[PDB]
Amino acid sequence: PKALIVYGSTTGNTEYTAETIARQLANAGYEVDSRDAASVEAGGLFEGFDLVLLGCSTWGDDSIELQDDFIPLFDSLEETGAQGRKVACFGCGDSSYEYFCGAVDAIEEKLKNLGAEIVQDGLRIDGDPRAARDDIVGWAHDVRGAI
Ligand SMILES: Cc1cc2nc3c(=O)[nH]c(=O)nc-3n(C[C@H](O)[C@H](O)[C@H](O)COP(=O)(O)O)c2cc1C
């Protein structure tokens, strides 16, 4: 079908992760449009995608702070056309720090009550994803059998 990926990556782990998801999708005979996020503007941004994939790294340590590029999107996730949209979420973190991938936890909270349809619990990556490469591949594959 037609899937979307918006991601926020500060050092690249979340980016690696997404392109891994994206090559696996496309390879599944999809249509995928992958974006960095910084170049996305809320304004009906999900509107025409079959599947939408949000994904978010986490910083702050003492509090949960969304990856810099992600905040504005997040703040306008209302203007996206989230309602009734098919969505899944994925992000990178460290089991260390208290709030282990809160950004993830937040983003979910808010499109489910935005009316979005969480098709699968999301990917919470501990450490280097290159080290959890097949685990994305498993998930990516899991989002595929949900819809
Ligand atoms: C100062 C600092 C704070 C961090 N806080 C968290 C955190 O609260 N939760 C988490 O899962 N990871 C935390 N991390 C680890 C990052 O999430 C990790 O670098 C992540 O894999 C980066 O993904 P990215 O390169 O797409 O931004 C923190 C890292 C630093 C340097």
UniProtKB/Swiss-Prot annotation:
Keywords: Electron transport, Flavoprotein, FMN, Transport. Gene3D superfamilies: 3.40.50.360. The keyword Flavoprotein applies. Signal peptide: none annotated. InterPro entries: Flav_short, Flavdoxin-like, Flavodoxin, Flavodoxin/NO_synth, Flavodoxin_CS, Flavoprotein-like_sf. It comes from the Bacteria. One of its GO terms (molecular function) is FMN binding. SUPFAM superfamilies: Flavoproteins. Residues 3-144 form the Flavodoxin-like domain. Its cofactor is FMN. Disulfide bonds: none annotated. Low-potential electron donor to a number of redox enzymes. Belongs to the flavodoxin family. This is Flavodoxin. It comes from Nitratidesulfovibrio vulgaris (strain ATCC 29579 / DSM 644 / CCUG 34227 / NCIMB 8303 / VKM B-1760 / Hildenborough).
